[PDB]
Amino acid sequence: NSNICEVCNKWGRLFCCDTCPRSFHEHCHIPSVEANKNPWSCIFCRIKTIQERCPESQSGHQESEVLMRQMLPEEQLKCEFLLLKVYCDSKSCFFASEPYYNREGSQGPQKPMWLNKVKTSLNEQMYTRVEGFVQDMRLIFHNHKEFYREDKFTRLGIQVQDIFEKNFRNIFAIQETS
Ligand SMILES: [Zn+2]
Numbered sequence: 001n002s003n004i005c006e007v008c009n010k011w012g013r014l015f016c017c018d019t020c021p022r023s024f025h026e027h028c029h030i031p032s033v034e035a036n037k038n039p040w041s042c043i044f045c046r047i048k049t050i051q052e053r054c055p056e057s058q059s060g061h062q063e064s065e066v067l068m069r070q071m072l073p074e075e076q077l078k079c080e081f082l083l084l085k086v087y088c089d090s091k092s093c094f095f096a097s098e099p100y101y102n103r104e105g106s107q108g109p110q111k112p113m114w115l116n117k118v119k120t121s122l123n124e125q126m127y128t129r130v131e132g133f134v135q136d137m138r139l140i141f142h143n144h145k146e147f148y149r150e151d152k153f154t155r156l157g158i159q160v161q162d163i164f165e166k167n168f169r170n171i172f173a174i175q176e177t178s
């Protein structure tokens with residue numbers, strides 16, 4: 001197994017996947033690494049299993065259809081993984097914890113949002129459809145773009161949103177387009 005966490009790329013107290021060579025800190029894995037279970041399979045392995053059990057799940061989908069899916073266990077898992085993939089980028093640090101807004105010439109968003117809040121919401125099963133999760137994720141970056149206006153810092157929101165969107169299209173097998 002790897003000697004660094006897959007998500008944050010640091011050593012420490014790591015839990016090792018039994019079915020692939022990835023390792024995780026306890027709270028870097030999503031969901032948090034489970035207490036017992038030997039063997040243990042990581043979220044990357046669990047996602048691969050879903051695809052292997054239903055190869056047709058990789059045929060292209062319409063986003064509108066994906067968003068209306070109820071958050072049954074497989075969709076819950078896919079959202080957990082998608083959230084994890086965003087945490088895997090180091091620029092996610094900017095969007096992880098609760099922001100505050102005090103900049104001359106801007107007003108903060110009406111509905112602040114951040115990754116750790118989405119993480120809690122997933123953990124507490126607060127989303128009933130995929131749409132709920134996707135709307136909160138997109139709101140994080142939209143709020144950032146709106147607040148930072150022409151500061152070049154706006155680009156961080158564009159960057160992390162692109163990681164979100166690419167991973168969304170991959171995980172939920174959205175039909176490729178030009
Ligand atoms: Zn970590």
Ligand SMILES: [Zn+2]
Nearest residue numbers: 017020042045
């Ligand atoms: Zn694994």
Ligand SMILES: [Zn+2]
Nearest residue numbers: 053054055056
């Ligand atoms: Zn099948």
